[PDB]
Design a protein around this motif. Structure first.
Motif, PDB file in Angstrom:
ATOM      1  N   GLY A 167       0.814  -1.203   0.000  1.00  0.00           N
ATOM      2  CA  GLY A 167       0.000   0.000   0.000  1.00  0.00           C
ATOM      3  C   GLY A 167       0.847   1.252   0.000  1.00  0.00           C
ATOM      4  O   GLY A 167       2.071   1.178   0.157  1.00  0.00           O
ATOM      5  N   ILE A 168       0.221   2.401  -0.192  1.00  0.00           N
ATOM      6  CA  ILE A 168       0.988   3.637  -0.334  1.00  0.00           C
ATOM      7  C   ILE A 168       1.547   4.123   1.010  1.00  0.00           C
ATOM      8  O   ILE A 168       2.729   4.537   1.098  1.00  0.00           O
ATOM      9  N   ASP A 169       0.696   4.128   2.041  1.00  0.00           N
ATOM     10  CA  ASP A 169       1.079   4.610   3.382  1.00  0.00           C
ATOM     11  C   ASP A 169       0.097   4.097   4.455  1.00  0.00           C
ATOM     12  O   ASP A 169      -0.913   3.473   4.118  1.00  0.00           O
ATOM     13  N   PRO A 170       0.375   4.336   5.738  1.00  0.00           N
ATOM     14  CA  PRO A 170      -0.492   3.718   6.742  1.00  0.00           C
ATOM     15  C   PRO A 170      -1.908   4.249   6.766  1.00  0.00           C
ATOM     16  O   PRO A 170      -2.196   5.281   6.202  1.00  0.00           O
ATOM     17  N   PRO A 218       1.298  -3.160   7.786  1.00  0.00           N
ATOM     18  CA  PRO A 218       0.385  -2.616   6.790  1.00  0.00           C
ATOM     19  C   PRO A 218      -0.964  -3.367   6.721  1.00  0.00           C
ATOM     20  O   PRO A 218      -1.005  -4.586   6.766  1.00  0.00           O
ATOM     21  N   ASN A 239       4.284  -0.949   3.280  1.00  0.00           N
ATOM     22  CA  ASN A 239       3.828   0.383   2.922  1.00  0.00           C
ATOM     23  C   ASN A 239       4.936   1.178   2.310  1.00  0.00           C
ATOM     24  O   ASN A 239       5.998   1.303   2.907  1.00  0.00           O
TER      25      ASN A 239
HETATM   26  O1  LIG Z   1      -1.340   0.156   6.007  1.00  0.00           O
HETATM   27  C1  LIG Z   1      -2.139   0.549   5.128  1.00  0.00           C
HETATM   28  C2  LIG Z   1      -3.492   0.713   5.436  1.00  0.00           C
HETATM   29  C3  LIG Z   1      -4.354   1.166   4.439  1.00  0.00           C
HETATM   30  N1  LIG Z   1      -3.882   1.432   3.203  1.00  0.00           N
HETATM   31  C4  LIG Z   1      -2.582   1.251   2.946  1.00  0.00           C
HETATM   32  O2  LIG Z   1      -2.138   1.508   1.809  1.00  0.00           O
HETATM   33  N2  LIG Z   1      -1.728   0.801   3.897  1.00  0.00           N
END
Ligand SMILES: O=c1cc[nH]c(=O)[nH]1
Lengths: 218, 50
Positions: free
Chosen positions: A66-69, A78, A120
């Protein structure tokens, strides 16, 4: 499990042996940016930014990225939602339900599946604001994702917009699938067959497919 | 990259990979054209043109 010392919270980073070759560069990069990023309250907390570096890599066939938390309540793993409350993980779980025919479950976690490392791209965001720390993580993000992709057969990225340029961030080619984010319009994530695609690509590389039903929590 | 359509092509590529016993020009050209598509679409795949 080894550790290295940095000059800003979290001060210590613990890591599995398989990460050793990037750790001295990680230290240098983190030290130059951390004070800026720590001016904000973050998801996850600084003591959880690097917890995925405790995972081995050499047994990993797939990176799910995924891109970020989560804007809030990130655990450092993640997609992980301890009480199974975040929309994204529930959507991922419904897709796997549909795929595998497991209908009764109480949770899902990508981090307990053999052969999978959930990741992430950016390791924090300012609380409540997606991609707010892109500028800080940039060089670290490349360093770590490049290291992961030396080990995995398949990189699966979630978010068509977010990952439209992912190839430019990587040195060596790796099997790369970019699918929809779980919150994409028009149920597009529901129709997406990425988990099945990943398995066929693994077979094409004479690897064992992922047993996606291992993610369920009962 | 996403789709049911992509999955169908990969499955067919896998089936042809497991045979590798092409009895006509069609099948061998299909196999190689699928490799090209897979490599373009996913950057790198585990099989090679023959
Ligand atoms: O950790 C996460 C949670 C939601 N979406 C993400 O891309 N990463």
């Amino acid at each position: 499990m080894n550790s290295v010392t940095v000059s800003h919270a979290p001060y210590t980073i613990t890591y599995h042996d398989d990460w050793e070759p990037v750790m001295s560069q990680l230290v240098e990069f983190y030290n130059e940016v951390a004070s800026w990023l720590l001016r904000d309250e973050t998801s996850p907390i600084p003591d959880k930014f690097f917890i995925q570096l405790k995972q081995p890599l050499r047994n990993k066939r797939v990176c799910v990225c995924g891109i970020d938390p989560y804007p809030k309540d990130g655990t450092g793993v993640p997609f992980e939602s301890p009480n199974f409350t975040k929309k994204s993980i529930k959507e991922i779980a419904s897709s796997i339900s549909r795929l595998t025919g497991v209908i009764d479950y109480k949770g899902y976690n990508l981090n307990i599946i053999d052969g999978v490392i959930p990741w992430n791209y950016y390791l924090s965001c300012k609380l409540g604001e997606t991609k707010s720390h892109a500028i800080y993580w940039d060089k670290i993000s490349k360093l770590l994702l490049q290291h992961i992709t030396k080990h995995v057969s398949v990189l699966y990225c979630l978010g068509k917009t977010d990952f439209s340029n992912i190839r430019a961030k990587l040195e060596s080619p790796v099997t790369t699938i970019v699918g929809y984010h779980p919150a994409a319009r028009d149920r597009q994530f529901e129709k997406d067959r990425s988990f099945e695609i990943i398995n066929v690509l693994l077979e094409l590389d004479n690897k064992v497919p992922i047993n996606w039903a291992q993610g369920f929590i009962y | 990259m996403t789709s049911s359509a992509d999955l169908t092509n990969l499955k067919e590529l896998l089936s042809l990979y497991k045979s590798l016993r092409f009895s006509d020009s069609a099948a061998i050209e299909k196999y190689n054209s699928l490799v090209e598509w897979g490599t373009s679409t996913y950057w790198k795949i585990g099989v090679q043109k023959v």
